[PDB]
Amino acid sequence: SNAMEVTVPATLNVLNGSDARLPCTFNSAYTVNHKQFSLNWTYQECNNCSEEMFLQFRMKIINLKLEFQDRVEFSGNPSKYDVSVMLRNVQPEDEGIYNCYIMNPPDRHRGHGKIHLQVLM
Numbered sequence: 001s002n003a004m005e006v007t008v009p010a011t012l013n014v015l016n017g018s019d020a021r022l023p024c025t026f027n028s029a030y031t032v033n034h035k036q037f038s039l040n041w042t043y044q045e046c047n048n049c050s051e052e053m054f055l056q057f058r059m060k061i062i063n064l065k066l067e068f069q070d071r072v073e074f075s076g077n078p079s080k081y082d083v084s085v086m087l088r089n090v091q092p093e094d095e096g097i098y099n100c101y102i103m104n105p106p107d108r109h110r111g112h113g114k115i116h117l118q119v120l121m
Contacts, residue, residue, distance in 0.1 A: 002109070003109050003111075004026055004027065004028065004102060004104070004107065004109045004110065004111030005026065005027040005111070006024060006025075006026045006100065006111040006112060006113040007024070007026070007113070008023060008024045008113035008115050009023065009115055010114070010115070011115075011116045012115050012116070012117050012118070013118045013120055014117065014118070014119060014120065015090070015119075015120050015121075016090060016091065016092060016119050016120065016121060017090065018089075018090055019086060019087070019088050019089065020086070020087045020090045020094070020117060021085075021086050022085045022087065022098055022100075022115050024082070024083045024085075024100045024113045024115075025081050025084075026083065026102050026104070026111050027081065028104045028107045029107065030104055030106060030107050031079070032078045032079045032081065032104055033104075033105070034059065034060075034078065034079075035059065036104075036105040037078055037103070037104055037105070038056075038057065038101075038103040038105075039055075039083050039100065039102055039103075040053055040055075040056050040099075040100075040101040041055040041083075041085055041098065041099065042054065042098070042099045043066075043068075043096055043097070043098055043099075044097040044098075045095075045096045047097065049096070049097075051099065052066060054066045054068060055074060055085060057078060057083070061074045068087070068094070071088040071089055071090075072085060072086070072087060072088075073086040073087075073088065074086070083102060085098075085100075087117075090117075090119055092119045094117060094119055095117055095118055096116075097115070097116055097117075098114070098115045098117055099112065099113070099115075100112070100114075100115075
């Protein structure tokens with residue numbers, strides 16, 4: 001009621017070289033209008049580190065192709081309240097914080113999910 005519920009794993013542990021699905025779903029009393037829905041995914045190397053946007057939904061998916069190489073993919077379905085992303089062939093440098101920011105107009109509250117991705121040997 002006082003915020004948009006966003007469900008993500010607080011910590012996600014993935015083996016080096018495997019594919020990492022970053023799950024993110026949300027709740028809203030309004031359906032998802034692709035002409036107004038907003039999604040931003042950002043990455044940080046560390047807690048205090050600058051955020052780097054790497055994927056957006058604005059009318060459609062925009063993959064910013066950050067020099068992640070071409071390993072980021074969208075893995076969700078906005079109309080089904082799923083905004084997950086996929087990081088293929090995870091590398092040690094992918095360790096860090098992944099933020100999902102969600103707006104579903106006319107729902108007032110913005111959602112925020114935060115995942116700490118850790119890369120195992």
